[PDB]
């Protein structure tokens, strides 16, 4: 139905929101500290001296273990 298409799109967008905002390939699993923006995978997060959302300096990256994580 049309609703099938609508829900497919909703699901796709929710899944994409859980993917790294830089590489668009890997799940978000990293927090820039202290600002708290949690928008990257570990690989992209390691390479950024400044937060890509707010431009605050990254003191360190905290790995986050989220219930949504998949493999
Ligand atoms: Zn990434
Ligand atoms: Zn930030
Ligand atoms: Zn724990």
Curated annotation (Swiss-Prot):
Q: Where in the cell is it found?
A: Cytoplasm; Cell membrane
What is the induction note for this entry? Answer: Expression is directly activated by NR1H2 and NR1H3. Expression is not dependent of the sterol-response element-binding proteins (SREBPs). Expression is indirectly induced by LDL.
Mutagenesis or variant effect for residue 20 to A: Abolishes autoubiquitination
**Distribution of this protein across tissues and organs:** Ubiquitously expressed.
Entry comment on modification after translation = Autoubiquitinated.
**Coiled-coil regions listed in the entry:** none
Effect seen on changing residue 20 to A: Abolishes ubiquitin ligase activity
Q: Where is this region: Critical for homodimerization?
A: 64-66
Q: Where are the zinc fingers (RING-type)?
A: 20-55
Q: What are the boundaries of the signal sequence? A: none
Effect of substituting residue 22 to R: Inhibits LDLR degradation
Instruction: Report the function annotation for this chain.
Output: E3 ubiquitin-protein ligase that mediates ubiquitination and subsequent proteasomal degradation of myosin regulatory light chain (MRLC), LDLR, VLDLR and LRP8. Activity depends on E2 enzymes of the UBE2D family. Proteasomal degradation of MRLC leads to inhibit neurite outgrowth in presence of NGF by counteracting the stabilization of MRLC by saposin-like protein (CNPY2/MSAP) and reducing CNPY2-stimulated neurite outgrowth. Acts as a sterol-dependent inhibitor of cellular cholesterol uptake by mediating ubiquitination and subsequent degradation of LDLR.
Quoted from the entry, the domain comment is: The RING domain mediates ubiquitination and the neurite outgrowth inhibitory activity.
Quaternary assembly? Homodimer. Interacts with the E2 ubiquitin-conjugating enzyme, UBE2D1 (via RING-type zinc finger). Interacts with myosin regulatory light chain (MRLC) and TMEM4.
Would you tell me the protein name for this molecule?
E3 ubiquitin-protein ligase MYLIP
Q: Which organism is it from?
A: Homo sapiens
Gene label: MYLIP
Q: Which residues of the intact protein are shown?
A: 369 to 438 of 445
């Amino acid at each position: 139905s049309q609703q099938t298409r609508v829900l497919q799109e909703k699901l796709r967008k929710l899944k994409e929101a859980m993917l790294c905002m830089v590489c668009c390939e890997e799940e978000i699993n990293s927090t820039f500290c202290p600002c708290g923006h949690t928008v990257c995978c570990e690989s992209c997060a390691a390479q950024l001296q400044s937060c890509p959302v707010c431009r605050s300096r990254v003191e360190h990256v905290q790995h986050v273990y989220l219930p949504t994580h998949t493999s």
